Amino acid sequence: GNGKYFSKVGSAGLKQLTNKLDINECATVDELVDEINKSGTVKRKIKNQSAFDLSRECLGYPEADFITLVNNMRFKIENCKVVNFNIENTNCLNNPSIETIYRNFNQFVSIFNVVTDVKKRLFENASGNGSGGGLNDIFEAQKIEWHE
């Protein structure tokens, strides 16, 4: 899928969502959204969480170090999305943890652009008083020994 809504993805960013949302692998934000809106628990993750954190999670990004990195950087936002990112002070990222986040930061922006598109599709103008539906919220699947 051509990164129009998203960017720097190519199923790469989406897969990190599908990873943390535990949904199936998706082709576009629409497909990524497809699983989310179908899984009110997952949509609920979107709902409860902030996009910045949403995408951060997909990297396993440590929250403090991530917040620290972003604290030393400067961004170019485009339609609530990260189109460009750059750091202003790299000395602070010198901590392995920050460098970890910074080096792979391209992942986060990709994922973030995805996440941002998700919330824009579901929660924003699409009956944005509570999304389309949220019935299967209480009908969450508690699969015993889900994890391998």
Swiss-Prot record:
Signal sequence interval, chain numbering: none
Highest taxon in the source lineage: Viruses
Record organism: Vaccinia virus (strain Copenhagen) (VACV)
Quaternary assembly: Interacts with the DNA polymerase catalytic subunit OPG071. Interacts with UDG/OPG116. Component of the uracil-DNA glycosylase(UDG)-OPG148-polymerase complex; OPG148 and UDG form a heterodimeric processivity factor that associates with OPG071 to form the processive polymerase holoenzyme. Interacts with OPG117.
Residues of the full protein shown: 304 to 426 of 426
Protein name in UniProt: DNA polymerase processivity factor component OPG148
Known role: Plays an essential role in viral DNA replication by acting as the polymerase processivity factor together with protein OPG116. Serves as a bridge which links the DNA polymerase OPG071 and the uracil DNA glycosylase.
Family assignment from sequence similarity: Belongs to the orthopoxvirus OPG148 family.
